[PDB]
Design a protein around this ligand. Structure first.
Ligand SMILES: C[C@@H]1CCN(C(=O)CC#N)C[C@@H]1N(C)c1ncnc2[nH]ccc12
Length: 282
């Protein structure tokens, strides 16, 4: 009965879609007319951290892009739910293993371009994503993907180059650049690094045995507990990186390597990546 919001009683629950840090996402049909003509929507709620969800809502409200999941609205309870468009094929992490024979290198490069476009937009808006990994890239169809979660996303202040994180507890460390691990500083160039790791996942079709975590654990050892990040940083300082996936051509690997320069100022920009991938298409 605020017509500008979604009524909780009409978000007809269908099934779970996924879980993240603070939240879970569920598929609902929003059916206020009660005649089953309403649309299916994805609904993010706090897990069975209110301030955190509200910050994520403010970010997604402020984003509108072809390769960013579409904000639809809010449902208010105190509590709040974030309402988004539903993207039926789910994340790249679940979609790619099911579609190896359907998705070729050409299609993978088109996804790389779409990811880089959403990311260049995000950066232009002075946000750092902080969780760019295949599990957060949603597939609308065979031909299009969108960045689909913003739970760790932060604003960089005008004229500043990084955001300093005070709370690193949710951090995907095997997707993180050295400055994020060593100083909790997050630059747009730190999201470039994460994108290189995401690209690696995309090229290995998100095989679990080739995941950045599984691969780095093999390099540094799996039982270091709280010394894990320390060993990761040591490895990176030594210049080691994830290898070229087999079936990844050298020209693509070179783009990936440009995301992995140790120093953030030495890394490629997302605009340069967009153009670099497009030169490999047709
Ligand atoms: C890949 C999407 C982003 C990460 N997901 C989370 O649940 C994060 C949390 N908490 C799953 C979600 N997912 C499977 C979706 N599946 C279908 N439509 C969706 N719209 C928005 C998300 C979404």
């Amino acid at each position: 009965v605020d017509p500008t919001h979604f009524e909780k009683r009409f978000l007809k629950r269908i099934r779970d879609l996924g879980e993240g840090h603070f939240g879970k996402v569920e598929l609902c049909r929003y059916d206020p007319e009660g005649d089953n003509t309403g649309e299916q929507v994805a609904v993010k709620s706090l897990k069975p951290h209110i301030a955190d969800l509200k910050k994520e809502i403010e970010i997604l409200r402020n984003l509108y892009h072809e390769n960013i999941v579409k904000y639809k609205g809010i449902c208010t309870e105190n509590g709040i739910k974030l309402i988004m468009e539903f993207l039926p094929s789910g994340s790249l992490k679940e979609y790619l293993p099911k579609n190896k024979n359907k998705i070729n290198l050409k299609q993978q490069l088109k996804y790389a371009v779409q990811i880089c476009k959403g990311m260049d937009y995000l950066g232009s808006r002075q946000y750092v994503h902080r969780d760019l990994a295949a599990r957060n890239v949603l597939v609308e169809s065979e031909h299009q993907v969108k960045i689909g979660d913003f739970g760790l996303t932060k604003a960089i202040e005008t004229d500043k180059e990084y955001y300093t994180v005070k709370d690193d507890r949710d951090s995907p460390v095997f997707w993180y650049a050295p400055e994020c691990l060593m100083q909790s500083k997050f630059y747009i160039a730190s999201d470039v690094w994460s994108f290189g790791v995401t690209l690696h996942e995309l090229l290995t079709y998100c095989d679990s045995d080739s995941s950045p975590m599984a691969l780095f654990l093999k390099m540094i050892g799996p039982t270091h507990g709280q010394m894990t990040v320390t060993r990761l940083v040591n490895t990176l300082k030594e210049g080691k990186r994830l290898p070229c996936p087999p079936n990844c051509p050298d020209e693509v690997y070179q783009l990936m390597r440009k995301c992995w320069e140790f120093q953030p100022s030495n890394r490629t920009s997302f605009q340069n990546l967009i153009e670099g991938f497009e030169a490999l298409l047709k």
